[PDB]
Amino acid sequence: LVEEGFSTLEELAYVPMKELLEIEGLDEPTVEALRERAKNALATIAQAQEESLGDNKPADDLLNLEGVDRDLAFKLAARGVCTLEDLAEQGIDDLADIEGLTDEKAGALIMAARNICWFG
Amino acid sequence: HYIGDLVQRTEVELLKTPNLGKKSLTEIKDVLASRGLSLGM
């Protein structure tokens, strides 16, 4: 694949099927499987980074609790609190070290998360 | 401070307290039940 000029997962995911079928030893089923794997790899990479910080996964799940700014969602996700369920399971004591989160604001966010997850 | 104070609080009130998770609420219920007590008396 690298000798045929492919350097990125994006090229393999999006390049016209004809160029991948010009490679010696690739059949239409193997090219389709390679593209599906490349798209799934691209999807997984994006989701992983979005859950690690606050790009999309924690910027929607962890940020569901009213009051969560994007910065706080990334601070929560850096502690492994990636979802609104993960936040509903926390104590105030587990979040007390997050810069900009007061015990009252932590308690309000955990209660908002519990109201949505357990009482919605 | 006392078991009599705890027994008067409802489950919904205890879930509003700071640093009070679903796991700690289940522990409190299981322990009160072992003594024949229930929350909200």
UniProtKB/Swiss-Prot annotation, chain A:
Part of the processive rRNA transcription and antitermination complex (rrnTAC). The complex forms an RNA-chaperone ring around the RNA exit tunnel of RNA polymerase (RNAP). It supports rapid transcription and antitermination of rRNA operons, cotranscriptional rRNA folding, and annealing of distal rRNA regions to allow correct ribosome biogenesis. Participates in both transcription termination and antitermination. Involved in a variety of cellular termination and antitermination processes, such as Rho-dependent transcriptional termination and intrinsic termination. This is Transcription termination/antitermination protein NusA. Residues 1-54 are annotated as: Acidic repeat 1 (AR1). The N-terminal region interacts with RNAP. The central region is composed of 3 RNA binding domains, S1, KH 1 and KH 2. The C-terminal region contains 2 acidic repeats, AR1 and AR2, which bind to protein N from phage lambda during antitermination. AR2 interacts with SuhB and RNAP alpha subunit C-terminal domain (rpoA); AR2 cannot bind to both simultaneously. SuhB, NusG and the alpha-CTD of RNAP all interact with the AR2 domain and can displace the AR2 domain from the SSK domain (S1, KH1 and KH2) of NusA. It comes from Escherichia coli (strain K12). Coiled coil: none annotated. It comes from the Bacteria. The lineage of its organism: Bacteria, Pseudomonadati, Pseudomonadota, Gammaproteobacteria, Enterobacterales. Belongs to the NusA family. It is found in: Cytoplasm. Monomer. Binds directly to the core enzyme of the DNA-dependent RNA polymerase (RNAP). Interacts with nascent RNA. Interacts with the termination Rho factor. Interacts with the phage lambda N protein. Interacts with SuhB via the AR2 domain, crystallizes as a 2:1 SuhB:NusA heterotrimer. The rRNA transcription and antitermination complex (rrnTAC) consists of RNAP, NusA, NusB, NusE (rpsJ), NusG, SubB, ribosomal protein S4, DNA and precursor rRNA; S4 is more flexible than other subunits. NusG and the alpha-CTD of RNAP interact with the AR2 domain. (Microbial infection) Interacts (via N-terminus and AR2 domain) with Escherichia phage lambda antitermination protein Q; this interaction (AR2 domain) releases the autoinhibition of NusA. Residues 55-120 are annotated as: Acidic repeat 2 (AR2), required for interaction with SuhB, interacts with RNAP subunit alpha (rpoA), NusG. Sequence repeats lie at residues 1-42, 67-117. Disulfide bonds: none annotated. Induction: In response to low temperature. Negatively autoregulated. Induced by cold shock (42 to 15 degrees Celsius) (at protein level). The chain holds residues 373 to 492 of 495 of the full protein. Residues 1-117 are annotated as: 2 X 51 AA approximate repeats. Disruption phenotype: Mutants are sensitive to DNA-damaging agents.
Curated annotation (Swiss-Prot), chain B:
Acetylated on Lys-22 and Lys-23 in the presence of glucose. PatZ controls acetylation of Lys-23 but not of Lys-22. (Microbial infection) ADP-ribosylated on both alpha subunits by the phage T4 protein ModA. ADP-ribosylated on only one of the alpha subunits by the phage T4 protein Alt. The modification N6-acetyllysine is found at residues 22-23. Coiled coil: none annotated. Homodimer. The RNAP catalytic core consists of 2 alpha, 1 beta, 1 beta' and 1 omega subunit. When a sigma factor is associated with the core the holoenzyme is formed, which can initiate transcription. Both the N- and C-terminus interact with different regions of transcriptional regulator CRP. The rRNA transcription and antitermination complex (rrnTAC) consists of RNAP, NusA, NusB, NusE (rpsJ), NusG, SubB, ribosomal protein S4, DNA and precursor rRNA; S4 is more flexible than other subunits. Belongs to the RNA polymerase alpha chain family. The N-terminal domain is essential for RNAP assembly and basal transcription, whereas the C-terminal domain is involved in interaction with transcriptional regulators (such as CRP) and with upstream promoter elements. DNA-dependent RNA polymerase (RNAP) catalyzes the transcription of DNA into RNA using the four ribonucleoside triphosphates as substrates. This subunit plays an important role in subunit assembly since its dimerization is the first step in the sequential assembly of subunits to form the holoenzyme. Part of the processive rRNA transcription and antitermination complex (rrnTAC). The complex forms an RNA-chaperone ring around the RNA exit tunnel of RNAP. It supports rapid transcription and antitermination of rRNA operons, cotranscriptional rRNA folding, and annealing of distal rRNA regions to allow correct ribosome biogenesis. This is DNA-directed RNA polymerase subunit alpha. It comes from Escherichia coli (strain K12). The gene is rpoA.
